[PDB]
Symmetry: C4
Subunit: 482 residues, 4 copies
C-alpha cells in the first residue's frame, strides 16, 4: 500500500470537497495539479492531512495541560517517565513542522508550489515560533551545560516553558478545521465561537494557576508569599495545584483573592496580571453569550420588529382602537408570528423547486376545480405560479354585487358566504371557488361574497390570466367553450 | 360523564387551535383522526393534556425545591410525613410517564399513531431519564438491603438525589407550553426567555446551596470544612440552609466566599464548581438583559439609524448648514420620529383593510370637495387609494405660475397661501383643494401657491387620475361637464 | 390675572404642540374642547401642568433621598423642623393627587371628560398607591394612639416608610415628560434610558444603605449584627450612613461584603436581597451600556456590514486579488466610508427639497455648459433631477472609439483624458463635458475617453434626455439648431 | 529651508487628502486659500500639524502617567530633575496652545480665517481648560508666596494636579487623528473604539491608584487609614505605588478591597468613588467587547438570519421533510453559506468594473461556444451582462421534451444529462451549452435535459436575447445564417 498513501495525500471526494471546488471533474483536475510532485507535497484539504491535524490536536491539548503542571508541581523533572513523554512529544512536533513545509496553504486558489511558494511563505510568517515550540530547548541547554546547579535548574524551567508556543499552532489548526466544518456540516457560528472561547478560558485559567505557584517555586518560596503564608509548601502536589487553580479561577470570574491580599510585590503583580487577564476573558465571554442569545431568538425578534413598524404607522395615522385591533388580528392570521418575504424567497430559488412548492401548496386546490382537470399539466403549472395568496377577516366583503371583479378566488381554506339577492345564501367552504363567471366577460360582477369565518384565498387577477392564456391559445379556446 | 373525558382528550376549539390548524372544519377533521383509538391516545394540543401539564408543573416546581433540602437538612429521612409526600410524588410522576406514551408528539403534522410511532420515538429519546426520575430508587435500594448502616444511609441520599432528573421533563413541558402561549397570546419572546432564565438561576442557586452543605453531610462533617469551622453543626436547620444559600448565591453573583476561603480540597472544588456555574449563569443573564433592552427601544433605534443615513448622505454631498437644518425639520414633520415603509405595509395588508384605512384618512378630505359628493362610492374609493401623502415646509412653492402642474393637491391640513398676480392673495386652510382646473386641460398652470405654515397634502397625479377614469367612463364624462 | 391662569391651564402653542396636533388652528380647536369646563379641567400637554410636574419632581427627588435617612439615622423623629418639612411635603402630594383628578389622560385622542372618564380611569388604575404615598399615615396612627411606647415607635417607622410609594408617581411623571421631550428636542433614546437607569440605581443603592441599618434599628441593635459587631452604634450619624451606603454599594457593583460576612439570619437575608437587587441592576446597566455603544457607531457599523457583503460576493465568484483591490478602491472613492441609499432618501423627501439639493450639487456643473445658459430654468431643473452620479477609476475607458454612446457625461470633477486618433490628446478637468455630439445623432461615437485620475461624472442617458425633451418641445427644437 | 516650512504648513497631497478634497487641482485650490496669510495660519489636515500632534501625544501620555505619581510618591518635589522636566513640559504645552490659535478648525468647509473665526471659536469653547493645563499654576503660587509651610505644600500639590486637564486635549487630538486614519487606512471602528477605551481604563486605574495614596498624603497619614494600618508609610515608594494600583485595580475589575474594608470616612468615600468609576468602566468595556464580537462574525450571522426566514416560510406552508431538505441543499449549493444581493452590488458598481467582473466569470464559457468566436467583442460583452446565474439539484429537469423553452443555458459547470427519445443519451459536462436551437424558432423544444449531478448554469432568456440583438442588427442577421 505505497500508492494508497499517495492517494490519501491528494484531496478526496467528499461533500466538503465538492462544495469547495465543484463537481468530481473539478476535484480530479485539482488532484492532477497536486500529482506534479511525488511524495513531497500534501494538499491542505486532504483526508490524511485532516487525520494528522486531529492527531496533533489530541497530542497538543494534552501537552498544554501537562507541561506547565509538570514544570511546577514535580521537583524531579529529570525522571524517566516524564522525559520519555517529553521526547516523544518533541519528535511529534518536529514531524508536524516538517509536514507544514510540505503542506499547501489556502489563500483565491491554493498554492501547491513547493520550492518557492510553500517554503518562503511559511518561513516569512509562522516558522520561527513553531520551531521554538517543537524543539526541546531546555534539554539542549542542559546538555550544553554538561559538556549554581539550583540556579541552572531555575533557568531551565523558564526555557522549558517556551514549549507553550504550540498554542498558536493549535489555534491555527482549530481555525482552519472550524472553517472546513462550517462548509461541511452547517454549524452555528455563534455556538462555535463561544465554545472556542470557553476552551481558551479554561486553558488560560489553568496556566494562571500554574503561574501563581510557579513564580514562588522560581523565587525559592520566600517567607512573605501565598504558599509560605498558608503553610502548604510540603503539602501534596495535587492539593497545592487545586489551590492555585482556585486562586486563578477567582481572578478570572471576579470572585476575590486566595487566602489573603498579596504582601510581596511580585505576588501582587502576578495577581494584578491574572485579574486583567481574567477580567478581559470574562468580558469576552459575556459578549459571546449576548451574541448567542441574539442569534437564538433572531427570527422571532425580527417579526416583533416588523410588527412594531406597523404599530408606528398606525400611530402616525392616529387610527381608532377597533381598526388597530382588526389589523393586529389580520397580521396574526396572515403571518402567524413569522417573518419572510415570500416573493424574494421564490426569486432566490430555482424554477423546478418553485414549481414543486406551488404543487404542494395549490395542486389540490386547482385540481378539484373541473376546469383544470381536462387541461394540460404545463398550463396548470403556469396558472399556479401566477396565483397570489390572500387572507380575509370575518365580516368582510371579498366580492360585491355590481362592482367589477378584477380577480377570481379559489378557496383553499376557510368559512365563506355567498350573498345573493335572488338565490338566498349558499355558504362555501374549503375547496370551493368563485369569480369564475367574470373571467372572459369583461364586465360587472353579479352577486356579493362575504367572509363568515377567517379565509385563505388564492387570488388570480384577470390580467395575469390573460397573460397565462397568451402562451396556450388552444387552452384559451377550450376555456371559451363554457 | 364518560364521553366527556374522551371529548376533553381530543383537541378543543380555541383561539390557539384555529391558528394552528385553521377553521373549525379542520379541527373536526383532526379530532376524527384522534378518534381512531379509544381511551388509549391523547392529543398534544388538548385541554385535558394542558391541565395535566399544569398540575405536573405545580407539583414539579415544589418537588425540585423540596427534595434536595429534605435530603440535606433533615436527618430523619424515614419519618412518616416526608415518606408519604415522596410516595405520592413518585406515583404522580409514574402516571405522567404513562401518559407520555399515550400522548402524541409534535413534529410537520402531529403523529397520533400509538403502537409504533409513539412508543418507539419516546423510548429512543427521553424515556430512560424520565423513568429514573419518576421511580423511588433509594427506597427500592433500602428495601433490597432489608430483604455499615451509616454508610448505607449515605449511599441512599445520593440515589434519592437522582429524582432531580425531573427537571429535564419540567423544562420540556415549559418549552412546549411557552410555544403554545406565543401562538395564543402574542407574548414578548425576550421577556419570556429572561423570565425562564431567572427561574433556572434561582433553582440552580438553591441546588448549589444544598450541595455545599450536602457534601459535608456526606463526608460526616470533617474538622476542616466550612460547617465545622464556623461552629454551626448543631444549629437550627433553617439557619444553616440560609447560610448555605448565601454562600451559593455569592458565587452566582460574583460577590465573594462564605466565612473564609476553602481549606479542605473537596470544599474548594465545590466552590470552584459553583463559581463556574454561577459565572456562566450571570453571563447568560447579562446577555438576556441586553437582548431585552435592545427589543424594548427597537423602533426608536431604527428611526435613529435611518436618520443617520440621511445625515451621512448630506455629509457626502457637503451641504450647507441651513439646507441640512431644513431637511431635519422636514423629516421631523414628515415622519414624527417614527419608522415605517407605508407602501410595503399596505401591500402586506388585504384590500378591504386598506380601503378602510384610506376612508379613515381621506374620506373627510375628499367628501368636502363638491366634485366627489354626487359621484359613486366605488369611484371615490378608487380615487382615494391612488392619493399620495406629501409635506411642505413654510416658505415653499407647491405650485408655480406658468409651470405645468402634473398633479393636483387636496389640503387635508396646514396653512397654505394662494399667490396670484390678478386676484391678490386668498390664504387657504385645512379642507381646501387646488390644481383642480389643471386636470383635463393638459397645459400650463395659471397662478402660484406657497406654503404659509407647514402643510400636509394629498397629491394626485394626472396620469393616476386618467388611469382611475379608465375604469369609470361615465364618471369621466360627468367630470368633463365643468 | 384670573383669565391668565385659565389660559395657562389650556394647551399652549409651542414647537411640541404643533408637532402633536398640527397647525395653530388645530391647537385652537383642542383648546376649545378644553374650555367646555371652567377651572375644573387641566390639559396634559399644558404649560402650567408641565411647571407643576417640574415642581413635583424637584420636591419628589429630595423627599425620596431624605425620608429614609430621616427615618433611620435620626432618633428624635418628633422634632419641629423635620415635622414641618414632612407636613408641607404631604400637603404638596395631596395637592398633586387632587390635580391628577382634574388632569386629562393621554391614550388616540386625549380624554378631557371629567365626571366619568377622568375620575373612573384614574381610580381604577393608580389612585390607591398615590393616596397612600401622599397622606401622612404614621402621623395619623400616632394621633389615634394618643386619642410599649418603643414598640409603637418601631411600628410607626415602617408605616412612615410607606411614603416611598411616591416613587411610582415620579417614574410616571418622568416617562411622560421624556416622551414629550423626544417629540420636542429629538433626544437620543439610548442616552435617555441609560440616564434613567443610573438615577434609579443611585436611588436603589441609597435605599439599600438605609435599609441595612434600618433593620438593625428596628431590631434594637442585637449583639450579633454588623452595627454592633463593628462597634459603631453611638458613632456620628453621618459616618454610619456612609458605611451603610458603602455596604449597599459593594453589593450593587459586586465588590464584596462590609466588615464581615453576615452572622445573624436577618442580616444575611438582607444582604442576599441587596445582592439580588444589586446584581440585576448591574446587569441592566451593562445591557444599557451595550445598547448605547451599538447606537453610537451605528452608521459606521452598517457601512462595514455592507462592505462585508461585497467581499462575500467576490469570494463566491473567486475573483483575482487585483480585481478585488480595484473594487475596494472604487468603493472607497464611490462611498467614502458611508452608507446611504440615495434614491430612497430622495423619494422620502418632497419635490422642492430635492430640487434645492440638485441645484446645490449640479447647477454649477450644468450652468458652465453653454447649451443650458440660454435655456429656461424649469427645463434646467428637469434635466438636473434626471442626472445620475458616477465614479471611474484611473486607467478606465469611460467612452470608446466606435462604440455607441447611450449616455453623455458632465465632469463635475476629476482628471479625464480625451483619446482621439486624429486630434492627439486634450486632457479634460473639472467643469468640462462630453458625449454631447452623440445626443440626437442616434449612432456610433467617434473618439475614446479614458480616466487619467479618479473621476466623478454625472451621466445623462439618451432615453432620459428624450423624456425630458418630451415636456419642452421648443427647447428640443432650439437644441436641434447646433 | 524657510519656504519648506511654509509648504509643510499647507495641506500635502496624500491618499487621505485626495479622498477628503478630490483631485490634485482641488488640493492646490485649498492650498491657495491657506496661502492668504503668511506664517500665521496652519491647516488642520497638514503634515507638519500631524507631526506636531504626534509629538504632543508622545509627551502627553508620558506626562499623564508621570505627573500624579511624581506628586504623590516623591516628597522632594522641588528637586532639579523633576522641576526641569516640568518646566519643559509646560513650555511645550504653551507652544501647543499658541499653535491652536493659528491652527484651522474642521466643521462643511474648514475655516482658515484667523482674526475673527479661529480666535473667537477657540476662545468660546476649549481655551480656558487648555490654558489651565499648560501653565505651571503651582509654581506660580509658590513664587507668589515667596515674594504653615507644610500647609502651603499640601495646597500646592492640589494646584499642580490641575495639569491633568491636558487629558481633554489629548482626547481631542486622538479623536481627530482616528477620524483621519479611518479616511486613510480603512480601520475597523469597533476595534479602534475598544482600544481607546482600554487606554482610558488603564489611565483611570493609574489615577485611582495615585489618588488612594494621595488623599492619605494630603491628610498627613492618619492612624486609621489603609497606609498606616498596613504599616507601609516608610516603605519603598515603588512598592507603595504598586499596592495602591492593586487596590484601585480591584475596584475597577470588581475583585475586592485592599487589605481591609475602609475605616476612616474619607478613605471609604474614595473607595466608593473608585468602585463607581471602576464599575462603569467595566460595563463600558463589556459593551465594547459585545459590539466587537457582533462585528466580527457579522456576515455569517446575516446569512444565518436569512436562512431562518426561509425556514419560517417553509413552516408557514407546512412543507414535507424531503422538500425542506432539498431546499436546504439548494441553498447550500446556491449561496455557499454567504449573503449578498448580486444585482444590488452590480448596480452599486460602475460599468467598466461590472464588465470586467462578467469577463472574469463568463468569457471562458461563452468563448468556447463557436457562435461567439467570430462575433464582435462589444456584442459579446452585451450578451454576457444579460446572462443570469442558476443552480439545479441532481434529478431535476432543466428543459423538457415538448415544452416551450423560454431561455437557453450555458453550462459553466456541472454534470448534466441530455434526455432524448431518438438519440439515446449524451451526458454533458462543463463548457457545453443547450437550448440553442430554440432561440429564433419561437416554438416548442424537442428533447429533454435532466441534471445528473449539481449544476451551475447561466440562463439567457429569449426576450433578453432579442433586446441584445436590437442593438446589433448585423450580428442578428449573421446568427440567422445557421
Amino acid at each position: 500500500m505505497q500508492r494508497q498513501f499517495t492517494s490519501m495525500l491528494q484531496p478526496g471526494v467528499n461533500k466538503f470537497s465538492l462544495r469547495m471546488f465543484g463537481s468530481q471533474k473539478a476535484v480530479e483536475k485539482e488532484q492532477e495539479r497536486v500529482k506534479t510532485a511525488g511524495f513531497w507535497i500534501i494538499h491542505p484539504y486532504s483526508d490524511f492531512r485532516f487525520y494528522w491535524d486531529l492527531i496533533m490536536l489530541i497530542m497538543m491539548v494534552g501537552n498544554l495541560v501537562i507541561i506547565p503542571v509538570g514544570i511546577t508541581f514535580f521537583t524531579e523533572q529529570t525522571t524517566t517517565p516524564w522525559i520519555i513523554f517529553n521526547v516523544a512529544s518533541d519528535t511529534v512536533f518536529l514531524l508536524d513542522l516538517i509536514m507544514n513545509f510540505r503542506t499547501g496553504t489556502v489563500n483565491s486558489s491554493e498554492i501547491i508550489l513547493d520550492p518557492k511558494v510553500i517554503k518562503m511563505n511559511y518561513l516569512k510568517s509562522w516558522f520561527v515560533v513553531d520551531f521554538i515550540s517543537s524543539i526541546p530547548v531546555d534539554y539542549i541547554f542542559l546538555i550544553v551545560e554538561k559538556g549554581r546547579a539550583l540556579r541552572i535548574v531555575r533557568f531551565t524551567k523558564i526555557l522549558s516553558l517556551l514549549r507553550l508556543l504550540r498554542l498558536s499552532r493549535l489555534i491555527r489548526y482549530i481555525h482552519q478545521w472550524e472553517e472546513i466544518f462550517h462548509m461541511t456540516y452547517d454549524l452555528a457560528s455563534a455556538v462555535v465561537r463561544i465554545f472556542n472561547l470557553i476552551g481558551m478560558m479554561l486553558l488560560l485559567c489553568h496556566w494562571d494557576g500554574c503561574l501563581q505557584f510557579l513564580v514562588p517555586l522560581l523565587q525559592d518560596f520566600p517567607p512573605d508569599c501565598w504558599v509560605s503564608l498558608n503553610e502548604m509548601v510540603n503539602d501534596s502536589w495535587g492539593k497545592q495545584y487545586s489551590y492555585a487553580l482556585f486562586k486563578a479561577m477567582s481572578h478570572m470570574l471576579c470572585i476575590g483573592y486566595g487566602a489573603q491580599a498579596p504582601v510581596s510585590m511580585s505576588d501582587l503583580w502576578i495577581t494584578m496580571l491574572s485579574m486583567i487577564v481574567g477580567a478581559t476573558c470574562y468580558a469576552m465571554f459575556v459578549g459571546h453569550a449576548t451574541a448567542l442569545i441574539q442569534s437564538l431568538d433572531s427570527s422571532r425578534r425580527q417579526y416583533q420588529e416588523k410588527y412594531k413598524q406597523v404599530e408606528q404607522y398606525m400611530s402616525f395615522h392616529k387610527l381608532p382602537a377597533d381598526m388597530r385591533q382588526k389589523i393586529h388580528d389580520y397580521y396574526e392570521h396572515r403571518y402567524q408570528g413569522k417573518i419572510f418575504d415570500e416573493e424574494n424567497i421564490l426569486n432566490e430559488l430555482n424554477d423546478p423547486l418553485r414549481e414543486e412548492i406551488v404543487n404542494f401548496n395549490c395542486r389540490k386546490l386547482v385540481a378539484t376545480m373541473p376546469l383544470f382537470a381536462n387541461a394540460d399539466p404545463n398550463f396548470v403549472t403556469a396558472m399556479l405560479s401566477k396565483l397570489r395568496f390572500e387572507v380575509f377577516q370575518p365580516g368582510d366583503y371579498i366580492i360585491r354585487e355590481g362592482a367589477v371583479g378584477k380577480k377570481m378566488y379559489f378557496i383553499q381554506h376557510g368559512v365563506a358566504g355567498v350573498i345573493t339577492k335572488s338565490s338566498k345564501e349558499m355558504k362555501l367552504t374549503d375547496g370551493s371557488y368563485f369569480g369564475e363567471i367574470c373571467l372572459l366577460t369583461k364586465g360587472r360582477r353579479t352577486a356579493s361574497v362575504r367572509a363568515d369565518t377567517y379565509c385563505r384565498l388564492y387570488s388570480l387577477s384577470v390580467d395575469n390570466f390573460n397573460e397565462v392564456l397568451e402562451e396556450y391559445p388552444m387552452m384559451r379556446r377550450a376555456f371559451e367553450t363554457v
